[PDB]
Amino acid sequence: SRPRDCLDVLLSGQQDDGVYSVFPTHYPAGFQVYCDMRTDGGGWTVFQRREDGSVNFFRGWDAYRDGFGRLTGEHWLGLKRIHALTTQAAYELHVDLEDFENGTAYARYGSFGVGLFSVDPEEDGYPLTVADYSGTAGDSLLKHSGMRFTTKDRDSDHSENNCAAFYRGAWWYRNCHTSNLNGQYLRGAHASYADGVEWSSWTGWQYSLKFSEMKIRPV
Amino acid sequence: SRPRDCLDVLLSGQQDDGVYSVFPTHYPAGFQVYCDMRTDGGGWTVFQRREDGSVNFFRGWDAYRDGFGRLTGEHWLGLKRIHALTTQAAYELHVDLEDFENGTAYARYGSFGVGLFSVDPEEDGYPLTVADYSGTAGDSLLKHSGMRFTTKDRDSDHSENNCAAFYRGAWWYRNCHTSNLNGQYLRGAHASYADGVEWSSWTGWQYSLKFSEMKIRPV
Amino acid sequence: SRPRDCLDVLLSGQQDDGVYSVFPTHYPAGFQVYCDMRTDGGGWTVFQRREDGSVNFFRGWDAYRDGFGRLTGEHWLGLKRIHALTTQAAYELHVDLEDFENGTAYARYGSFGVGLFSVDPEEDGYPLTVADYSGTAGDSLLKHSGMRFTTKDRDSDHSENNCAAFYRGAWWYRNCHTSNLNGQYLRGAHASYADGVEWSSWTGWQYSLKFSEMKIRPV
Amino acid sequence: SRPRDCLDVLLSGQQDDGVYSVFPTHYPAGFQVYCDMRTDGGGWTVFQRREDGSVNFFRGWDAYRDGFGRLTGEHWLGLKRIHALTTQAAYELHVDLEDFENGTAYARYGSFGVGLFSVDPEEDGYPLTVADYSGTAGDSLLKHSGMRFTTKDRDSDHSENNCAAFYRGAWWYRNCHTSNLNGQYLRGAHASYADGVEWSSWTGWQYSLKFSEMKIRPV
Ligand SMILES: *[C@@H]1O[C@H](CO)[C@@H](O)[C@H](O)[C@H]1NC(C)=O
Ligand SMILES: *[C@@H]1O[C@H](CO)[C@@H](O)[C@H](O)[C@H]1NC(C)=O
Ligand SMILES: *[C@@H]1O[C@H](CO)[C@@H](O)[C@H](O)[C@H]1NC(C)=O
Ligand SMILES: *[C@@H]1O[C@H](CO)[C@@H](O)[C@H](O)[C@H]1NC(C)=O
Ligand SMILES: [Ca+2]
Ligand SMILES: [Ca+2]
Ligand SMILES: [Ca+2]
Ligand SMILES: [Ca+2]
């Protein structure tokens, strides 16, 4: 009756992609999420999706903490929820990407987590944990491992300036990034540098992807 | 022991109209509500009631989010509670109205919801979901489908100005409305335009109703 | 394992007065309270106690809402907790008083409640519900029935001024009071008017009591 | 399935030191903590650790209330959590210390608690309860019994000034202290007076320890 994530939902007999209620160990009130029941067997809990630029992603700290957008469309689940999910078990991360030319690619990471051992994940900046890459999109996230999450109004990166403001996004910026999936929906090639929905290892630093979806599943 | 709404309360053997405790899926602490155990079989959870103008409804955003008034009289349950209720299952909406001339009418909607797929229903403005009308009061709500909730201190309507301020209420304003049940208790016909407890399809834009009650029941 | 109040604690086999954990229906996290297991059979949950003036009771709204002092001594449980307790069942109120001359008296009320039907008890001012007096101290509370709770920084009384500020306390002031148990610990007779720990029906308006304890038990 | 502390975790079959989920009686959502499963039989819940000066401990009131640092390294669990743990049962405290010269020592207290009978532990300043010393480090905490917790931005000590600011730490200061484990990581002997990680009874007032760990276990 109380699935902890989309894998529990799947194993309980629910095979259709869609919105379901999940109840993380330390977030007993629970919340709704979009479940991908098809990718590599299914059971993936989505936490980010870009697909048409209908939602503004250049948001501040509170928004990235609490989440925004809609589960059936573009959205960000919220770092407080992502933390609740990834700390209750060992999760893997799957990232699906799509360009404006019919092309698709993906990146899988054997281990993924946010603020895994932080006493206060929010004050600690929801530090990223990620490793073990494999896929077709190439790795554009391993360099971000260990970095705190930075937004336009809360700098915690390794740059002299605010990477989030400079690259119009919100991410576990270093100095500054190799991936920027929460960047501006610029739609394809653009002159501005690395400030769109980027995944450098696949499409470079001046090409804003058409679609992106970040999801997790217990290892 | 833990009814999720008034229908569960009814099915458990409670047949008297009154105040009962309910526990929505994602609001485990629960809260009290007024249950209508008579209308069309009973089991309706009330979330709004106007009946004598004793309570001020020209309130701000926090009040409409958290609720105000008293369960045994005029009140607004609060968008956070209405959201908790309508997202846990598919609900229908029933609206009972009464004028100052002994007359009554009602409007039933096969589907009703608030912020159904919003990651953060409050930030998303508790968007309205409603469809499938039937009744005697006529439909004065379908045009509001998809609109966010707007209050005098938080504009999210499709008007150049603030509909909530202009029509002294709080509603899922468009530009501006066909219904305004949270408007001023003006008592019958009035010169001011559409700023009373209106249900245009039944009594027009210049007649403030004597009674209104909005309630929901699982489809 | 989860007593809802001190009566449940008593009925479970706990006969010693003391501090115990209770879990109100709509406050599942629970909290600790002092239980009186001797008065008229025992099972009373204490919510207020004055006994030596060691604690300041001239506090603001947040303090009276959340509570202050210590369970083993002078304290105020907090209106949010008192509300959680009195709305889960029908409770009676018992008030024990003591003067500085060895004398004692008590007042019992067959029904007692705070914000019983308020959608938002805090915004509604935790309105008092009380009736059916009997005892030796005389009735000094029935006149306060229906009044909202007023503090020095939140006026909701029927006076032109702030009763709480004027009589240095916090109570369900009318205009202004017949009882003021949260008043200043003035110790016996005093020149200032009605601004001490008063229970007018027993000791008048210019005598601050030595001891007072307010507690509840399911009817 | 719901251990209340690390002793429950141990008794359930978990013998490895590490991070585990615990669920205090009045903090049902639960949280993670580091468990010491080796010291004197194991089952100790850690709430403070200093080991390399990588974390800033000169923090304000909110930080000491909510916690900071990481469970696998230097951290402070947070007074709200320590309170939730120590009020659910009778706990003993164990303090392990280490200097920069290979030396180690410890202090054990038969009884330990924070804000044990406070209606609102935070407003009451999380008062310290501690007694019954035994060990090799000597007692440097008994004098602090009964004192409230003081930080650089919230003075509640018995000093004319702010002990926390003066001795660059956060503690249950009196006037001012005999122990200062949350002080500056000064690394050994230092000229400044008593403003490092001190445990006076063992190493004096001008020697900042290399390691310290504070943990609790049910008596
Ligand atoms: C191209 O896009 C279409 C539309 O989604 C999709 O069905 C197809 O699999 C994609 N790839 C190719 C090679 O057509
Ligand atoms: C008129 O109002 C009365 C009073 O509530 C009610 O009993 C009655 O059913 C209403 N309708 C008619 C036709 O009397
Ligand atoms: C007077 O006070 C004492 C002390 O608490 C108490 O034992 C006694 O019952 C009181 N009443 C009388 C008549 O002594
Ligand atoms: C000295 O430090 C080492 C390193 O941690 C430790 O193994 C040893 O037990 C300590 N004491 C002595 C006497 O070596
Ligand atoms: Ca920076
Ligand atoms: Ca507008
Ligand atoms: Ca007044
Ligand atoms: Ca001081």
Question: Domains in chain B, please, with CATH?
Answer: 1-137+211-219 (3.90.215.10), 138-210 (4.10.530.10)
Is C13 part of the contact surface with chain B (CB cutoff 8 Å)? no
**Which residues is B212 bridged to in the sheet?**
B50, B97
C58-62 LR contacts (CB < 8 Å, sep 24+) = C58/C152, C58/C168, C58/C169, C58/C170, C58/C184, C59/C151, C59/C152, C59/C170, C60/C151, C60/C152, C60/C153, C60/C154, C61/C151, C61/C153, C61/C154
CB within 8 Å of A205: residues ≥ 6 apart = A193, A194, A198
Please check whether residue B167 is in contact with residue B177, taking contact to mean a CB–CB distance below 8 angstroms.
yes
| Of A112, A164, A122, A104, the residue nearest A142 (C-alpha) | A112
Please check whether residue B185 is in contact with residue B200, taking contact to mean a CB–CB distance below 8 angstroms.
no
Token readout for B186 is 């003006």
What distance in Å separates the CA atoms of residue C73 and residue C63, rounded to the nearest whole number? 17
- Name every chain A residue with its beta carbon within 8 A of the beta carbon of B148: none
State the nearest Cα–Cα gap between C174 and chain D, in angstroms. Answer: 28
The alpha carbon of A161 and the centre of ligand 5 are apart by a number of angstroms equal to 4
Is C27 part of the contact surface with chain D (CB cutoff 8 Å)? no
Select from C2, C26, C119 the residue whose CB has the most chain B CBs within 10 Å, as the one to mutate to test that interface. C119
What angle (nearest 5°) sits at the alpha carbon of residue D163, between those of residues D160 and D169?
A: 170
Residue in B with minimal Cα distance to C123: B68
What distance in Å separates the CA atoms of residue D33 and residue D19, rounded to the nearest whole number? 5
Mapped onto helix, strand or coil, the DSSP state of residue D94 is: strand
Place of tokens 């155990």: B37
Residue in C with minimal Cα distance to D24: C29
Type of residue at B35:
C
CA dihedral B159, B162, B164, B170 (to 10 degrees): 80
CB contact under 8 A, A26 and D28: no
- Name every chain D residue with its beta carbon within 8 A of the beta carbon of C21: 25-26, 88
CB contact under 8 A, A32 and B123: no
Which structural technique was applied? Answer: X-ray
Count of all residues that appear for chain A in the document:
219
The alpha carbon of A147 and the centre of ligand 5 are apart by a number of angstroms equal to 12
- Residues C19-47 as b/e (b if ≥16 CB within 10 A, e otherwise) read ebbbbbbbbbebbbbbbbbebeebbbbbb
Task: Give the start-end residues of each E strand in chain C.
Answer: 18-22, 31-36, 44-50, 68-69, 75-76, 91-98, 104-114, 128-135, 179-180, 188-189, 198-199, 207-208, 211-218
Is A26 part of the contact surface with chain B (CB cutoff 8 Å)? no
Interface of B with C in 55-94 (CB under 8 A): 63, 66-73, 75-78
Token readout for A101 is 């030319």
Residue in A with minimal Cα distance to B118: A70
CB atoms within 10 A of CB D151: 26
- Name every chain C residue with its beta carbon within 8 A of the beta carbon of D119: 66-71, 75-78
CB contact under 8 A, A119 and D67: yes
CB atoms within 10 A of CB C145: 16
| Of C191, C192, C200, the residue nearest C171 (C-alpha) | C200
